Ligand binder design. Structure first.
Ligand SMILES: [Ca+2]
Ligand SMILES: [Ca+2]
Ligand SMILES: [Ca+2]
Ligand SMILES: [Cl-]
Ligand code: NA
Ligand code: NA
Ligand code: NA
Lengths: 467, 6
């Protein structure tokens, strides 16, 4: 019979297990025999305390580098305010050592863990590319709890070198099966930020992860958008418990918070899943998340049922990760067919937006051709438009099966007159639907002001298979 | 105003 860990703070790790069912069902994976042995995870952040008493036994120098100072040692820089504690807190969530009388345990407490020191300095395109592309035939899973500013007025994503690093990773990384990139969806809730305005979370090559509070609510910092895939627990109000992990200066903390704590927990659960089937591709892993995640008892006002009967929300994606279900379904999973891509240029002429614009188009989804798609994965609406105040726009897209995705909600702080320049808004909400038929795009002015602009390009890009 | 934030 499985014996659960004896670490002193393990009883406070409410999100791992318990009899209440408000947990990620991690103990059920442990009891099936999966604890992370043989899997390598790298934390891309401000450094990792490699000599920490709850990390030293799992530390892997092959998964580590210091891009800020150009050396192999990722030790954080010590300061009076402990500014560089962030990466060490994230690492302990994944792979803190078990049964050693220190702090708590990681989700994958027998995995190997490294860190890339890259946030303690100016974060250029080259700095990002060198970190995402580190040792891609040794590191299996990359975790990133950082991104563009969450001020509610920024539109930004990976530049050329960083985008090239994503494509190289999913194509040639992990022996051709593809690197796994896990991303925190953002902390911009108080600013009414949208995570579709962040190109890292909006990318098809990352698994974007949101947060839920202990009592099952949408936290104050949460950002809603259609590109989010799933959810893990994190912090909420001061009556709700928080995350337990390793802290700087060889300490233990019980107050790790925010979107930053959600992505590491997802990375650990994905590490358990890879141990259960090391042949899973980067796309296999997203299929498993979609099928096994759990909406039950997460509170939101926008839960909707999509074309294949699955519940989906802009705050939570397909719901909470379920580690026991992930490892069980992985063991006999059949690899998906190669990915197809069908490009449909919608507009014949530019269209004035005015107060409201609706664009309807019936598509065949490349019928008769080698890239015919009957089983959708991701879909993008790539839009070029001008407008006088960007944050007054709201944008929706409806699939032929009737699923309505919010591509952009109103952003009160976004005063920009710069519009969108071929920006690829992405939705996960129509996964496994047939994309043949009528699609509808809606753009509307949500304010009483007399705003003006023009839509000049709309490309619908479909990804998926025909089996 | 950093390009990227924790
Ligand atoms: Ca160093
Ligand atoms: Ca421990
Ligand atoms: Ca954001
Ligand atoms: Cl592509
Ligand atoms: Na490949
Ligand atoms: Na993503
Ligand atoms: Na149809």
């Amino acid at each position: 019979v499985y014996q659960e860990p004896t670490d002193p703070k393990f009883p406070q790790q409410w999100y791992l297990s318990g009899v209440t069912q408000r947990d990620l069902n991690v103990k059920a994976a442990w009891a099936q025999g999966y604890t992370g042995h043989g899997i390598v995870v790298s934390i891309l952040d401000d450094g990792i305390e490699k000599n920490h008493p709850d990390l030293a036994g799992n530390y892997d120098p092959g998964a580590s580098f210091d891009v800020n100072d150009q050396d192999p040692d990722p030790q954080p820089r010590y300061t009076q305010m402990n500014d560089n504690r962030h990466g060490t807190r994230c690492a302990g969530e994944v792979a803190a050592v078990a049964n050693n009388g220190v702090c708590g345990v990681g989700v994958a407490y027998n995995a190997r863990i490294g860190g890339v020191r890259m946030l303690d300095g100016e974060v250029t395109d080259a700095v990002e590319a060198r970190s995402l592309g580190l040792n891609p035939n040794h590191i299996h899973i990359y975790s990133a709890s950082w991104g563009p500013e969450d001020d509610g007025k920024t539109v930004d994503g990976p530049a050329r070198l960083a985008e090239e690093a994503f494509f190289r990773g999913v194509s040639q990384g992990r022996g051709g099966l593809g690197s796994i990139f896990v991303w925190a969806s953002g902390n911009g809730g108080r600013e009414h930020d949208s995570c579709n305005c962040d190109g890292y979370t909006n990318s098809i090559y990352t698994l974007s992860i949101s947060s839920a509070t202990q009592f099952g609510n949408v936290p104050w910092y949460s950002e809603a958008c259609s590109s989010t895939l799933a959810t893990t627990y994190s912090s909420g109000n001061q009556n709700e418990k928080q995350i337990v992990t390793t802290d700087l200066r060889q300490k233990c903390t019980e107050s790790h918070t925010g979107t930053s704590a959600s992505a590491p927990l997802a990375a650990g659960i994905i590490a358990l899943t890879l141990e259960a089937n090391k042949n899973l591709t980067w796309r296999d892993m997203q299929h498993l998340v979609v099928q096994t995640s759990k909406p039950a008892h997460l509170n939101a006002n926008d839960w909707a049922t999509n074309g294949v009967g699955r519940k989906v929300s802009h705050s939570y994606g397909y719901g909470l990760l379920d580690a026991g279900a992930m490892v069980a379904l992985a063991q006999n999973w059949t690899t998906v067919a190669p990915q197809r891509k069908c490009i449909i240029d919608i507009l014949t002429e530019p269209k004035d937006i005015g107060k409201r614009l609706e664009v309807r188009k019936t598509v065949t989804a490349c019928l008769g051709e080698p890239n015919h798609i009957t089983r959708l994965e991701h879909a993008q609406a790539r839009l070029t438009l001008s407008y006088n105040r960007r944050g007054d726009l709201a944008i929706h897209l409806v699939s032929p099966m009737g699923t309505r995705s919010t591509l952009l909600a109103a952003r009160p702080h976004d005063y920009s007159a710069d519009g969108f320049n071929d920006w690829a808004f992405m939705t996960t909400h129509s996964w496994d639907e047939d994309p043949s038929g009528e699609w509808v795009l809606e753009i509307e002015n949500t304010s009483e002001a007399n705003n003006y602009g023009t839509l000049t390009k709309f490309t619908l890009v479909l990804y998926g298979t025909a089996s | 105003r950093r390009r990227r934030k924790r």
